[PDB]
Enzyme design. Sequence first.
Site, PDB file in Angstrom:
ATOM      1  N   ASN A 187      20.776   3.861  11.711  1.00  0.00           N
ATOM      2  CA  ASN A 187      19.116   3.881  11.270  1.00  0.00           C
ATOM      3  C   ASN A 187      18.946   2.391  11.464  1.00  0.00           C
ATOM      4  O   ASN A 187      18.148   1.768  10.944  1.00  0.00           O
ATOM      5  CB  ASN A 187      18.823   4.326  10.037  1.00  0.00           C
ATOM      6  CG  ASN A 187      17.250   4.700   9.805  1.00  0.00           C
ATOM      7  OD1 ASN A 187      16.557   4.809  10.910  1.00  0.00           O
ATOM      8  ND2 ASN A 187      16.960   5.008   8.641  1.00  0.00           N
ATOM      9  N   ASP A 197       9.547  -6.340   3.811  1.00  0.00           N
ATOM     10  CA  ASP A 197      10.966  -6.009   3.146  1.00  0.00           C
ATOM     11  C   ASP A 197      11.051  -6.674   1.805  1.00  0.00           C
ATOM     12  O   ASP A 197      11.439  -5.911   0.858  1.00  0.00           O
ATOM     13  CB  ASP A 197      12.108  -6.538   4.084  1.00  0.00           C
ATOM     14  CG  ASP A 197      12.336  -5.826   5.436  1.00  0.00           C
ATOM     15  OD1 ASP A 197      13.020  -6.043   6.154  1.00  0.00           O
ATOM     16  OD2 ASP A 197      11.533  -4.662   5.560  1.00  0.00           O
ATOM     17  N   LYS A 214      23.971  -0.760   4.613  1.00  0.00           N
ATOM     18  CA  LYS A 214      23.223  -0.965   5.986  1.00  0.00           C
ATOM     19  C   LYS A 214      22.916  -2.392   6.193  1.00  0.00           C
ATOM     20  O   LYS A 214      23.148  -2.867   7.522  1.00  0.00           O
ATOM     21  CB  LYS A 214      21.767  -0.447   5.755  1.00  0.00           C
ATOM     22  CG  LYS A 214      20.815  -0.290   7.030  1.00  0.00           C
ATOM     23  CD  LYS A 214      19.754   0.754   6.990  1.00  0.00           C
ATOM     24  CE  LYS A 214      18.880   0.913   8.354  1.00  0.00           C
ATOM     25  NZ  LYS A 214      18.249  -0.333   8.691  1.00  0.00           N
TER      26      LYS A 214
HETATM   27  O1  LIG Z   1      12.400  -7.933  13.632  1.00  0.00           O
HETATM   28  C1  LIG Z   1      13.261  -7.658  12.555  1.00  0.00           C
HETATM   29  O2  LIG Z   1      14.098  -8.182  12.235  1.00  0.00           O
HETATM   30  C2  LIG Z   1      12.363  -6.773  11.312  1.00  0.00           C
HETATM   31  C3  LIG Z   1      10.793  -6.724  11.426  1.00  0.00           C
HETATM   32  C4  LIG Z   1      10.190  -5.644  10.209  1.00  0.00           C
HETATM   33  O3  LIG Z   1       9.905  -4.479  10.917  1.00  0.00           O
HETATM   34  P1  LIG Z   1       8.302  -4.432  11.190  1.00  0.00           P
HETATM   35  O4  LIG Z   1       7.676  -5.323  11.985  1.00  0.00           O
HETATM   36  O5  LIG Z   1       7.900  -2.931  11.804  1.00  0.00           O
HETATM   37  O6  LIG Z   1       7.682  -4.579   9.986  1.00  0.00           O
HETATM   38  C5  LIG Z   1      11.417  -5.552   9.154  1.00  0.00           C
HETATM   39  O7  LIG Z   1      10.762  -4.628   8.255  1.00  0.00           O
HETATM   40  C6  LIG Z   1      12.779  -5.007   9.565  1.00  0.00           C
HETATM   41  O8  LIG Z   1      13.445  -4.933   8.416  1.00  0.00           O
HETATM   42  C7  LIG Z   1      13.497  -6.293  10.424  1.00  0.00           C
END
Ligand SMILES: O=C(O)C1=C[C@@H](OP(=O)(O)O)[C@@H](O)[C@H](O)C1
Length: 427
Positions: free
Chosen positions: A94, A313, A411
């Site tokens: 995931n 996050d 994770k």
């Molecule tokens: O680019 C990244 O490393 C991430 C961007 C975020 O997603 P979104 O851009 O969909 O918010 C975050 O929530 C994810 O855990 C990691």
Amino acid sequence: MESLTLQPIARVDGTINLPGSKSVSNRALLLAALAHGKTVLTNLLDSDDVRHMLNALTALGVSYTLSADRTRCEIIGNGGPLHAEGALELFLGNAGTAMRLLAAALCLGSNDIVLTGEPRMKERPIGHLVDALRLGGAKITYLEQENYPPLRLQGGFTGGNVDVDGSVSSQFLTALLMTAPLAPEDTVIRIKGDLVSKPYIDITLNLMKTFGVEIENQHYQQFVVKGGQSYQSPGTYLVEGDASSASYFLAAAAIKGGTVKVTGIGRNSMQGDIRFADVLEKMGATICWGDDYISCTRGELNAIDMDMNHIPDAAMTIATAALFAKGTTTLRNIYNWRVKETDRLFAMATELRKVGAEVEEGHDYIRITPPEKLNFAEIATYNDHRMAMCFSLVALSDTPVTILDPKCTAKTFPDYFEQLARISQAA
Ligand SMILES: O=C(O)C1=C[C@@H](OP(=O)(O)O)[C@@H](O)[C@H](O)C1
């Protein structure tokens, strides 16, 4: 159903050496694989999401070695786009970062690869990215539901004028930015409207520059990329400690410290989640910044009402820390919590009510009114590492808490509970 019960924690105090950043780790691994030369990554995160990226690189023919603790990785760069045929299936768990990054990168040249993952991954949107890649020439097929993985990638991204929607996930733009430099033609990426999770774009650009590539950023509305470039090994590269993983420990001090210091991130970090510290400060905690640490010391904790789009996050951590704050906390502009590891607005609201809070689950916000005292609950974790970590904070009270499926923290943070225990004190 496995579970862990956390006994009340009287005080927290101590120092945590953070695990590596998942965001930086997966970007650095893909760039190292595409680059020319050998890249040595240190402080790499060992977690499920990184292991899925490593497994994908292995399947694609990339050679690398890992140290005993899997935090040092020597990658032999492929010196160009990665390839596989025969509808090779890459299972990505995931890991959104792996899915989105590889969906774009593997569109370079010819290929015949299928990207899939766990059931929930087939429910996390990717249509905005597919739309953009297709405008650039890529051939992509949805094998199940339109706009979601699994995808069959048959290559063809050559560049050109590409529009991309940045309103649901910044990861689509990130994936395009990392891919475009290697396309044969120049690419102009135009953002359709709003751009969420903006700080993650800065992480992407920082990593690209480390690997030898810069682009023209026109106020985050349009990005001009020159094609025909090559990524180059930066030699040895230190992966920053994970600022999102740090949030739990800094928040723990704001609630029940003591002083908790996290090392591996500091004032110079590229991660947007270090701004989580600013929220704790606004709530009444004291924060100290160092070159390679951030620490939080208990002060007081007052409710806040803030737009959290810049730290989606780490913002979840404020939702449970809110249980200990004076007043009603409101976290706004966090719609995409609904399309991540689980629908986090539904999950957070549901579990917070179980421990006694009155919660308004807004369409794109959450309002939390803490109870006078928390009660015991068995917390469902929705196969989401952050639900487990956020609710671990309930134990910084007079009541124990039982966390279902505690191993879901692997994770991004396999050793989460031992680390929380390290700073947990009885006196
Ligand atoms: O680019 C990244 O490393 C991430 C961007 C975020 O997603 P979104 O851009 O969909 O918010 C975050 O929530 C994810 O855990 C990691």
